[PDB]
Design a binder for this molecule. Structure first.
Ligand SMILES: CCCCn1c(-c2c(C)ccc3[nH]ncc23)cn2c3c(=O)[nH]c(=O)n(C)c3nc12
Length: 275
């Protein structure tokens, strides 16, 4: 674990607020003093008191993975505290929290270009993740964090693996026989793209799991979010191709969004499951 995660000294960490509760213990905010004396805001995940040895391994397991990525669109690990208690994972602070809950508070309040900027960041981070040989397997708006400048970053590597499961975000073939590839992450990205353009609407609403699985398999797809640019809806559909080999690669997705960011006059054509 200390291969990719530097041990931090607890005296350099101030805790200034309990901000949430994770799968493993509280999540807080605070500050970290770096060796250069610079002070930065950080998110701090704590491991619950009474943790079993297993929980400790899983908890720090996420840090070992996170510590492998250094990219502007992947949550940055600052380090871990293990030589004292509570055990902690320290990451950069994202002032605007989870992307889905953020967008829900701002229904229709952003411009197409702003939403596309968010989406470009996510794709860029996923491009790097897939470049590194990892499948995320849990790519969803709730696992994207957004900072004070609207920069979006991939997080939560709990289910991530080198090359249970959230049914709504998982590709047909991964649901069918656990075929997880980068192309199954591209499927998830398509769902994320839908979440963004829908400002945090839940994928497939409250349909039963059984029906989500069946409908998608039969070729049904989420419908165009209100006022969704045709270009972006078609990108969802491309991400949701039945043949995984026909989905774009994250590199192509980045390229597509980069173009849309340029001529927003592309975005002027505007568009129950669709067959
Ligand atoms: C996907 C989010 C899981 C919990 N987590 C982590 C985090 C931490 C601290 C350690 C490992 C992690 N893996 N993935 C995230 C993560 C950092 N943050 C923040 C945050 O920085 N700002 C905020 O406003 N909120 C709400 C935050 N919530 C978290």
């Amino acid at each position: 674990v200390h291969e990719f995660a530097k041990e931090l000294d607890a005296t350099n960490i101030s805790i200034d607020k309990v901000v949430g509760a994770g799968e493993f213990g509280e999540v807080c905010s605070g500050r970290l003093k770096l060796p250069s004396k610079k002070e930065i805001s950080v998110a701090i995940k704590t491991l619950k008191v009474g943790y079993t040895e297993k929980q400790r391994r899983d908890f720090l397991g996420e840090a070992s993975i996170m510590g492998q990525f250094d990219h502007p669109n992947i949550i940055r690990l600052e380090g871990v505290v293990t030589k004292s208690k509570p055990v902690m994972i320290v990451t950069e602070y994202m002032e605007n929290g989870s992307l889905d809950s953020f967008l829900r508070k701002h229904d229709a309040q952003f411009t197409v270009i702003q939403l596309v900027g968010m989406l470009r960041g996510i794709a860029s981070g996923m491009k790097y993740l897939s470049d590194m040989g990892y499948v995320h397997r849990d790519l969803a708006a709730r696992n994207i964090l957004i900072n004070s400048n609207l920069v979006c970053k991939v997080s939560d590597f709990g289910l991530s693996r080198v090359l249970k499961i959230p049914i709504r975000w998982t590709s047909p073939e991964a649901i069918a026989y656990r075929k997880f590839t980068s192309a199954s992450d591209v499927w998830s990205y398509g769902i994320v793209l839908w979440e963004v353009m829908s400002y945090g609407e839940r994928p497939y609403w409250e349909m039963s799991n059984q029906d989500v699985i069946k409908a998608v398999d039969e070729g049904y797809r989420l419908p165009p979010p209100m006022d969704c640019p045709a270009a972006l809806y078609q990108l969802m559909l491309d991400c949701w191709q039945k043949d995984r080999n026909n989905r774009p690669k994250f590199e192509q997705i980045v390229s597509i969004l980069d173009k849309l960011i340029r001529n927003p006059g592309s975005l002027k054509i505007i568009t129950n499951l669709l067959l």
